[PDB]
């Protein structure tokens, strides 16, 4: 109760509350899913309407021709971090004329996100990202936290009620690799479906899809672009 | 200038002329070229006069600060290092050619320091525009471990050769003798040059200059 | 870090500045320091706190500082803080002389320091200068002048004022005797002794305990003079003759 004001204060339990409270912002944000195959990496995101008369808030952002991100938490911290990711990618192509390897970018985030968690009067980045990428080592799904820790994932979901989406991905993780692009997206939004309360389901309004892979560069599908994937709505049982 | 130094049996003798020049005209007939560094170390200076004065005063100041902290008598190596590292840092733009000499707990030490920051440690050194003339005397007459009076004669003869041969040098010969227990700062050691007596009278008498305005201001 | 910060440049809920006000309490402990403006000149008269038998007396003064060729000041508050401000005042006065080749006018010198003192109340997070100053001077714009400074950075011109110990009781005592437009340095000094004698804790009042300086105009140039031992002794015993005369 007196250790939770700064990042520089260790608690008697060996914990830092400011880093832990920053992680709460990821939970408070809207749920998103990310999964990969042997060729494609797909991000599916659930958009939120602030007061269903305003448009559903943006969730998937461009980083490079081969990297795209899904956000959860503070939007302003998400854009700030995205600009960093965009900058490091542009730097790589300027100097080496080759795409920056996903893993290397993620570890650059791990160093940048650490710096503030150790200086007085600073705060952690109140945003968790799901990075989808494709390079020489194939498709990638990465997760970043307010704690500068990052994870290499077979499949991942973060946000509100993401636990139910995580358990679906747990069940169907043995099918993701040999499976095709059209089936991957279906598995992705079927996990995102599980987060929603039993009343409301997926629509052209509240779903965003980001895809990057072998043949195609990172593309965002939003409104009318998302309907080919919804066409094939398996319907929800419980 | 002509400045020179010698290491003898008991310590160090330092010598210098007293001529300062601006252009090809003598500015000062009697200027002090042997400078105080510490009660046991003195330094001769040649080249840019103002550079000579300020460089020699700064290091003297810095050594006093050093010797107060240590409580010990300062070393000639410290004087050497301080002068060397400064003159180098200024890439030779401080035009100070120096003859450094003193007596330590280590013994008698003599240095020549160049404007660019190069040092030499030698039994006899000469600097200045009259250095060649002074160095000639040393090469011809210097002997190892000579007596104080003999070393006084040698250095003075070297300075004399610089005076009577280098147009940049003239007037009085100054000496500084430093040993393990004594220091002699002999200001006018020799006066080999004097102005001829004015046997013609040109004293301008009272009322020979026309005045236009006069104001007298009284004081305390 | 913010735990150890005492926030010196912050606002009170009332709408005031605590550190300034607390600095003002410090001035009320320093020696009684007063100055009054006359027609033929202007003077400063201060209570000396350095009154110990074993003191040496090296300087011409204790609390009277000379700032300019035409200006002088006295101090009430923390002595060390005063030495900072008075040195700065000398610098400000010289910068003006460097720039315009004329002496700095009394207001311009006061305001310059006051802007520095104000800065310490608004930003920086540091304690204010615990000093109030009285300024006496002459310029070709307003002639003989008397000014007053606060830790807040506030300034004011006065015909007669007092700062320091028993400030309130001395001002009402000044209101009683001061006559605007008809005041002379002769009577000004008499008033100065009158106020200090009553306001000070010592009821005898020796020359050792007071310090008086006068700023006059002698044939073109300005004369700042700190009064000698016997000159003060003469003014004090003259006041006693007027005190014993009060048997009417």
């Amino acid at each position: 109760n007196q250790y939770d004001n700064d990042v520089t204060v260790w608690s008697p339990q060996g914990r830092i509350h400011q880093i832990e409270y920053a992680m709460e912002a990821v939970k408070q944000g809207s749920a998103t899913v990310g999964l990969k195959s042997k060729t494609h990496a797909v991000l599916v995101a659930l958009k939120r309407a602030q007061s269903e008369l305003a448009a559903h808030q943006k969730k998937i952002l461009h980083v490079d021709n081969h990297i795209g991100i899904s956000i959860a938490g503070l939007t302003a911290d998400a854009r700030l971090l995205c600009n960093f990711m965009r900058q490091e990618c542009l730097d790589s192509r300027f100097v080496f004329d080759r795409p920056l390897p996903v893993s290397r970018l993620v570890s650059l985030i791990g160093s940048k996100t650490q710096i503030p968690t150790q200086r007085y009067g600073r705060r952690p980045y109140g945003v968790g990202l799901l990075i989808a990428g494709y390079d020489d080592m194939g498709p990638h799904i990465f997760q970043t936290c307010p704690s500068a820790n990052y994870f290499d994932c077979r499949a991942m979901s973060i946000g509100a009620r993401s636990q139910s989406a995580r358990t679906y991905l747990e069940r169907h993780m043995s099918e993701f690799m040999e499976c095709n692009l059209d089936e991957l997206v279906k598995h992705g939004l079927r996990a995102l479906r599980e987060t929603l309360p039993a009343e409301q389901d997926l629509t052209t309004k509240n779903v965003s899809i980001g895809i990057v892979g072998k043949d195609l560069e990172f593309t965002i599908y939003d409104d009318d672009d998302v309907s080919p994937f919804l066409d094939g709505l398996e319907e929800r049982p419980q | 200038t002509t400045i020179a130094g010698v290491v003898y049996k008991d310590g160090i003798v330092l010598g210098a002329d007293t001529r300062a020049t601006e252009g090809m005209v003598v500015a000062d007939k009697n200027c002090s070229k042997i400078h105080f560094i510490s009660p046991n170390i003195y330094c001769c200076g040649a080249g840019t006069a103002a550079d000579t004065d300020m460089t020699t005063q700064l290091i003297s100041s810095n050594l006093e600060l050093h010797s107060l902290t240590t409580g010990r008598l300062p070393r000639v190596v410290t004087a050497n290092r301080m002068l060397k590292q400064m003159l180098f840092r200024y890439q030779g733009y401080i035009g100070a050619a120096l003859v450094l000499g003193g007596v330590d707990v280590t013994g008698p030490h003599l240095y020549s320091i160049y404007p660019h920051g190069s040092t030499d440690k030698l039994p006899y050194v000469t600097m200045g525009s009259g250095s060649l003339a002074a160095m000639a005397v040393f090469e011809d007459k210097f002997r190892p471990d000579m007596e104080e009076e003999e070393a006084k004669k040698l250095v003075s003869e070297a300075i004399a050769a610089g005076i009577f041969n280098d147009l940049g040098s003239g007037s009085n010969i100054d000496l500084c003798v430093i040993s393990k227990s004594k220091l002699d700062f002999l200001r006018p050691f020799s006066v080999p040059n004097k102005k001829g007596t004015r046997l013609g009278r040109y004293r301008c008498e009272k009322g020979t200059t026309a005045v236009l305005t006069e104001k007298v201001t009284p004081l305390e | 870090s913010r735990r150890y910060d005492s926030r010196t440049t912050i606002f009170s809920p009332e709408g005031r500045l605590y550190q300034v006000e607390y600095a003002m309490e410090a001035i009320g402990h320093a020696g009684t320091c007063l100055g009054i403006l006359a027609n033929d000149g202007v003077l400063l008269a201060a209570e000396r706190r350095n009154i110990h038998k074993l003191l040496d007396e090296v300087f011409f003064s204790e609390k009277i500082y000379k700032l300019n060729e035409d200006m002088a000041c006295s101090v009430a508050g923390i002595t060390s803080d005063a030495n900072v401000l008075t040195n700065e005042l000398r610098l400000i006065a010289q910068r003006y002389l460097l720039q315009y080749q004329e002496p700095i006018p009394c207001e311009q010198l006061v305001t310059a320091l006051c802007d520095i003192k104000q800065a310490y109340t608004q930003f920086g997070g540091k304690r204010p200068f615990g000093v109030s100053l009285l300024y006496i001077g002459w310029d070709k714009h307003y002639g003989f002048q008397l000014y007053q400074s606060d830790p807040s950075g506030n300034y004011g011109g006065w015909k007669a004022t007092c700062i320091g110990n028993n400030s309130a009781a001395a001002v009402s005592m000044l209101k009683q005797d001061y006559k605007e437009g008809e005041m002379t340095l002769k009577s000004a000094l008499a008033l100065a002794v009158k106020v200090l004698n009553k306001t000070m804790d010592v009821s005898k009042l020796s020359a050792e305990k007071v310090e008086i300086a006068t700023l006059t105009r002698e044939s073109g140039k300005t004369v700042i003079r700190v009064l000698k031992q016997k000159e003060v002794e003469q003014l004090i015993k003259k006041h006693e003759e007027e005190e014993a005369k009060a048997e009417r």
Partner: protein, 231 residues
């Protein structure tokens, strides 16, 4: 990884007192007693250097320090703080000599040192010095004795005492001080003022004393202290 606080650690209390300065004054009051006496012929500075163990080497550290060839210093309170003020005063004396080619006047040095002491009462992230200084000097054919306290205020003294039992020390001095005593006598009364606030009996290695006159400032040798100590 280092930074530095910008806010003052010394502030005005509700009663208008700078608490940290008065607490630093309590620090000097608990320190070893020291005495200074002007003698219209010279100045004497003498201080208690009561060691503790004899294992300590008496000649290793000094409480009486020379600032320059004509100025000396003694303190009461904290050793480490004093040493900082010594190096700072020595630098200030050298700054003056580089510019004017003339030994710094004692009054001019004290003012410059007091300013540094003043800085540590208003500057950010620092505490004041827990030291009062006794500065002696000889310039313009006159002896000088000054005191500089934690706040940065300075005073000219004929004779004064500071440290432990300074109140009794001063009362002892005003009864004993003559404004016409020579240096030899001044040194005698200086040791006597220390004797009043000592307990344990004095040796030449038990106290430290320095003198200042027309010949300059120097520390008195243990042989010279012993000779005066035949009370």
């Amino acid at each position: 990884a280092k930074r530095g606080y910008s806010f003052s650690l010394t502030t005005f209390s509700p009663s208008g007192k700078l608490v940290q300065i008065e607490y630093a004054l309590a620090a000097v009051a608990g320190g070893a007693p020291s005495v200074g006496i002007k003698a219209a012929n010279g100045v004497v500075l003498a201080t208690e250097k009561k060691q503790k163990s004899i294992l300590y080497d008496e000649r290793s550290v000094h409480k009486v320090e020379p600032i320059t060839k004509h100025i000396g210093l003694v303190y009461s309170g904290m050793g480490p703080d004093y040493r900082v003020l010594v190096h700072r005063a020595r630098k200030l004396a050298q700054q003056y000599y580089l510019v004017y080619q003339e030994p710094i006047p004692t009054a001019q040095l004290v003012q410059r040192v007091a300013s540094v002491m003043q800085e540590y009462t208003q500057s950010g992230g620092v505490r004041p010095f827990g030291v009062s200084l006794l500065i002696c000097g000889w310039n313009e054919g006159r002896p000088y004795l000054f005191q500089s306290d934690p706040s940065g205020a300075y005073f000219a003294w004929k004779a004064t005492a500071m440290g432990k039992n300074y109140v009794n020390g001063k009362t002892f001095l005003e009864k004993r001080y003559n404004e016409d005593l020579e240096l030899e006598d001044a040194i005698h009364t200086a040791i006597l003022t220390l004797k009043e606030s000592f307990e344990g009996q004095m040796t030449e290695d038990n106290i430290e004393v320095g003198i200042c006159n027309e010949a300059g400032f120097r520390r008195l040798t243990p042989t010279e202290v012993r000779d005066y100590l035949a009370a």
